Design a protein around this nucleic acid. Sequence first.
RNA 1: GAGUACACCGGAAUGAUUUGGGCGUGCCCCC
RNA 2: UUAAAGUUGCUGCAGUUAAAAAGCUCGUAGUUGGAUCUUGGGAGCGGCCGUCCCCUGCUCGGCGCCGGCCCGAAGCGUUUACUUUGAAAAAA
Lengths: 83, 149, 83, 129, 185
Amino acid sequence: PLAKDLLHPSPEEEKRKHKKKRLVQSPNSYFMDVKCPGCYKITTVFSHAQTVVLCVGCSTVLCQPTGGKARLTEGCSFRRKQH
Amino acid sequence: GRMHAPGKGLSQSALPYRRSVPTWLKLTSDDVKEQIYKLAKKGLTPSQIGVILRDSHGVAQVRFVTGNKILRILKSKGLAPDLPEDLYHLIKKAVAVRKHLERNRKDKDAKFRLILIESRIHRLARYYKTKRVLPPNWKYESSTASALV
Amino acid sequence: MQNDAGEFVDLYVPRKCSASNRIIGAKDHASIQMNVAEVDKVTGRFNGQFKTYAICGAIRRMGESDDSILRLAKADGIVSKNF
Amino acid sequence: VRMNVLADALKSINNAEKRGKRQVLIRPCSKVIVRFLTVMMKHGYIGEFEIIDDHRAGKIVVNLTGRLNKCGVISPRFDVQLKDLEKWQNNLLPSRQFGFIVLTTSAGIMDHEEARRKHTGGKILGFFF
Amino acid sequence: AKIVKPNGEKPDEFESGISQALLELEMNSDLKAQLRELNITAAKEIEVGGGRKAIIIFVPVPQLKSFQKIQVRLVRELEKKFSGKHVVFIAQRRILPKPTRKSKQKRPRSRTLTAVHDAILEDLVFPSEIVGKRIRVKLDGSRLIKVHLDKAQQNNVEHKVETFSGVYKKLTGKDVNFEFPEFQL
RNA sequence: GAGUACACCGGAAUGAUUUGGGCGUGCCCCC
RNA sequence: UUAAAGUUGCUGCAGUUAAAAAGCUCGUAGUUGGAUCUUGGGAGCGGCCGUCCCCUGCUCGGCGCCGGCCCGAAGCGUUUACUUUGAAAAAA
């Protein structure tokens, strides 16, 4: 390609490129919320939780730390959030 | 590339462009700072403090929600130790490697890595001497293992 | 070249590539004075006027000639923008 | 590591112009590079270029028009007087009807042709033709 | 009433009318639980390059963190009070001169020209925030800033972009346009 | 107040009267 | 002895095979070192731009005016490099 359009490329190319090789750098992680059906107390958990997170009040286990994204236990809903 | 390794790595954090406190968390600065002083009184490293905050309490960075980072706060009230945490970890690694070599004589790779980490701690000690953090006459010695572990 | 007398001392004006804005020399045989025809406005016929194009040897040598002829035809308006 | 941002930017422009890329991307940014690209585009070698303002270090998108042959730098930054510029433009330029040398005078980064009129010399950055 | 200028000077009647409107909306609406220390430094009437007029209100810097919670209701109250005029809050920072070598205390970077202009551009468009700033360079050398605005709270900010361009040109001198990218959010 | 579906109110809309809940602001429980 | 010598290469050499990268790593002297701190306009010379003025000062005094204003200033403005002007620099 003699001329790409690096002014405003397509967003599939922006997800195709690296997190730092993009036009403006932006992380590929997000902040998310999670609840347990057998309990109340709700916390907000990072997408790479990096450690075992406890329910706030010592009720249940929520995330298992892995190499990348943390794994949620079954029966727990999750949504992201944005501003 | 790396300072003491042949490989080149490209894997680090990448902050977003947005300069704002997000609206989905409504947590004022002072109660957050109270959580830092409580977690520091529990006896933990500021890196672990930032990890625990962004894990459980949902805050992205301290620098956007307050005017200061963690070590500025712990220096402002005074719970920050005199030994910096990275140099403390390098000291503890040097003590562990030296004890391993003391109980295992015929070894060369461990000795080579010991020379590498002594070079690293010396090159960092020059920086902490010229930025007036450490005392100017403070010299690390291999035999001074039980002073600051 | 101009001159103090106002007389051009040029002996022949060399042509220029329409794609990479480079100059086609005297002994370059990989260059084409391409002619493109436009349609008559009412139904389908041929007027007689020409829409001429040129390209040098290096662009065809690396092979980006189809891209260049698309951009030139889109700039002159032969090919629609949706494409 | 990287010692000269301006050299890497100019030699990236040199590579992408030598093949025939229409527009480029430059990874770091500096003020002196911005003034150099302005004097490039007001002498007409470079079209309407974009620079991007992020919060770490900016990036520069320069569209090219093909008139540029080679643009290079001189390292390290020597000093040149008004009596020594003639030798530098004799042994560094391809001709005398075209090709300019930028240099950091006391009035800022500007070309040698108006520096002869301004009667001010200083350190030297590079050249283009 | 609720106006404390840094200097003991009497300005024109317009900011007096602004303060009278503020006390009227304070005494009529249920805002008395959130307006105790909220002073106003200054206010100015301007006209954009067209057929409309706009209102600048200058506020002090540390007070604006309490002005986060008020600018959902206060802006619509001032818009329904003055129908043909748009209200906008800009913090009052000062620019310090560069410490030239022929010229005392250190100049902090919070008070420099770039930080003041960045803060002014950030506090102009409050309901929608910045996504990215681009800056063109023209043939004449005129640097043209184009800033990308958020998709969130889109419906409030189509009609105010010319007022923001006018106030930034008549306050700083830089031509600024506005755009809405839609391929990221 | 145990806040998952809930029992009390204060503001407030049409001299009188009054509209299912949760905090993850947008989709979840109940009809 | 000099040019030719771009065969001593700062302008301006070479190091896979022709002469030429230490077996490898660390390391004190030495060399080099990322971004960033001031913008813009006006009256006019004219039918946007080539010329020109503007944005650290506070005790002695000589251009005037009706005890106050530019002022001539003894006194002072964190250090360096770079560049232009000026002096001193013997003649042949």
